[PDB]
């Protein structure tokens, strides 16, 4: 039916590993002492969850995750506050998105309240892995995979749900904004209408690696995802895309693409539109933006700031775009960046407990 947090079986590790130095962390390469596992079958339903030492998984080579990408994931953080209390940030929005993605993958449904409480107990046991730095955090990685030992393409009769914990340094080791260059080639598409691009399913990511390898060979750090005959700008790598500018009607506007099927609905993207509506100092539009809209705006000095948004960066400014043989400069870093700074400081003030907020949950 569903596993229950109150049925948790806890098997502690006998020897603990030494914590790495917080200002030399490489994202997702170091892992904590413990993981969570929960097994499912169609014959016997959900087994009882386990909290046990990190270990390798024992998989049948026939497992449908390794053959037909029957798999999905999530990404959220835990923050050690300035009062030394550990907090989660909008974790219910992550659980909601994981459930929607499971239905679209035909993985078995689960109680969202029971997963989050299991996850809370996993961080509570391993709580010293949450760094003693207000520029560092602990990444939480829920993962859900088909483990059906057969090659037939179908809805799986077996599955594992597991959670990893990995400490991460600041995205900007400098401590202030390093702007990124983008590779813009219309030859590749990330996601299409009628597709799965608005879910965090593994198969959306496997196909982007060739494009990223090409971006790096041409000196860029990320891909700018183009879509359709009018070259709509959609996403920046695995981050949502925002543009602060004077629009076509002469009005100061913050703009992001709409949730029309090809966009991942980011927790950060939701948080930033809510803040922009509350401040009410400028227009806020979920609308379509093209390479023509952007180059026409730069000719008339109308562009202020371009930045990516996600759990990775919070905010990630853009300085240039390579497109049809030329480098196009974006004046983000010559305009402050005023809005990008204000956003970074507000969201970190909420994350690290410098102000009270509906958006945070203290670990009990």
Return residues touching ligand UUQ (CB under 6 A). 27, 75, 139, 151-154, 168, 171, 212, 221-222, 237-238, 310-312
Q: Binding residue for ligand PLP (CB under 6 A) from 267, 297, 313, 318?
A: 267
Q: Which is nearer to Mg ion, 92 or 218 (CB)?
A: 92
Name which position in 111, 117, 214, 320 contacts Mg ion (CB under 5 A). 111
Q: How far is the CB of 257 from ligand PLP (least distance, A)?
A: 11
Cα atoms in the 13 Å half-sphere on the side-chain side of 180: 23
What are 154's two structure tokens?
Answer: 């179908």
Nearer to ligand UUQ, 49 or 310 (CB): 310
Site for ligand PLP in 268-327 (CB under 6 A): 268-269, 310-311
Residue (of 146, 176, 171, 175) closest to 67 by Cα position? 146
When asked if residue 11 is in the footprint of a copy of itself (CB under 8 A), the reply is no
Identify whether 337 is preceded by a cis peptide bond (ω within 30 of 0). Answer: yes
**CB-based burial label for 244 (10 Å; 0-12, 13-18, 19+):** buried
CB nearer ligand UUQ, residue 206 or residue 258: 206
Phi-psi region of 343 (alpha: psi -120 to 50; beta: other; left: phi over 0): alpha
Based on the shown chain and the rule CB under 6 A, indicate whether residue 346 belongs to the binding site for ligand PLP: no
Q: What does 262 interact with, of ligand UUQ, Mg ion, ligand PLP, none (CB < 5 to 8 A by kind)? A: none
Residue where the block lists tokens 């099927």: 261
Spatial separation of the C-alpha atoms in residues 139 and 205, rounded to whole Å: 19
Least distance (Å) from ligand PLP to the CB of residue 208?
9
Burial state string for 161-178 with b = 16 or more CB within 10 A and e = fewer than 16: bbbbbbbbbbeeeeeebe
CB of 7 to Mg ion, least distance (A): 13
Which has the closest alpha carbon to 142: 192, 107, 174, 169? 107
Stretch that binds ligand PLP, among 11-19, 35-43, 234-242, 329-337 (CB under 6 A): 234-242
Q: Which does 300 bind (CB under 5 to 8 A by kind): ligand PLP, a copy of itself, Mg ion, none?
A: none
CA nearest neighbour of 257 among 266, 10, 249, 248: 266
Contact 158, 146 (CB under 8 A): yes
The minimum distance between CB 223 and Mg ion, in angstroms, equals 35
**Rounded to an integer, what distance in angstroms lies between the CA atom of residue 351 and that of residue 360?**
7
Binding site for a copy of itself (CB under 8 A): 26-29, 31, 35, 54, 56-62, 65-71, 73, 103-106, 139, 141, 143, 145, 149-155, 162, 164, 166, 186-189, 192-196, 201-210, 212-213, 237-238
Footprint on this chain of ligand PLP (rule: CB under 6 A): 75, 200, 235, 238-240, 264, 266-269, 310-311
């Amino acid at each position: 039916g569903t596993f229950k947090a109150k049925d948790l079986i806890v098997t502690p590790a006998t020897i603990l590993k030494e914590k790495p130095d917080p200002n030399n962390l490489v994202f997702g390469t170091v892992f904590t002492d413990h993981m969570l596992t929960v097994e499912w079958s169609s014959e016997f339903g959900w087994e009882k969850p386990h909290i046990k030492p990190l270990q390798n998984l024992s998989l049948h080579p026939g497992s449908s995750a390794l053959h037909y990408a029957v798999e999905l994931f999530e990404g959220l953080k835990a923050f050690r506050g300035v009062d030394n209390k550990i907090r989660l940030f909008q974790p219910n929005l992550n659980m909601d998105r994981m459930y929607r993605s499971a239905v679209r993958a035909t993985l078995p449904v689960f109680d969202k309240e029971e997963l989050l409480e299991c996850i809370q107990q996993l961080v509570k046991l391993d709580q010293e892995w949450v760094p003693y730095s207000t520029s560092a955090s602990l990444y939480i990685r829920p993962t859900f995979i088909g483990t059906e030992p057969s090659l037939g393409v179908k809805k799986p009769t077996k599955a594992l749900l597991f959670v990893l914990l990995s400490p991460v340094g600041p995205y900007f080791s400098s401590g202030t904004f390093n702007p990124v260059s983008l590779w813009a080639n219309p030859k590749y598409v990330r996601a299409w209408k009628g597709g799965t691009g608005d879910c965090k399913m593994g198969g959306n990511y496997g196909s982007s690696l060739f494009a990223q390898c090409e971006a790096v060979d041409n000196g860029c750090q990320q891909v700018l995802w183009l879509y359709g005959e009018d070259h709509q700008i959609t996403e920046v790598g695995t981050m949502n895309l925002f543009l602060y500018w004077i629009n076509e009607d002469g009005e100061e506007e913050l703009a992001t693409p709409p949730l029309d099927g090809i966009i991942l609905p980011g927790v950060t993207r939701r948080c930033i539109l809510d803040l922009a509506h509350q401040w009410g100092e400028f227009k806020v539009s979920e609308r379509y933006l093209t390479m023509d809209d952007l180059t026409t705006a730069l000719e008339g000095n109308r562009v202020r700031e371009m930045f990516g948004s996600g759990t990775a960066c919070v905010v990630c400014p853009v300085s240039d775009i390579l497109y049809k043989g030329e480098t196009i400069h974006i004046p983000t870093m010559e305009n402050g960046p005023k809005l990008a700074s204000r956003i970074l400081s507000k969201l970190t003030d909420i994350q690290y407990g410098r102000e009270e907020r509906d958006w945070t949950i203290v670990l009990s």
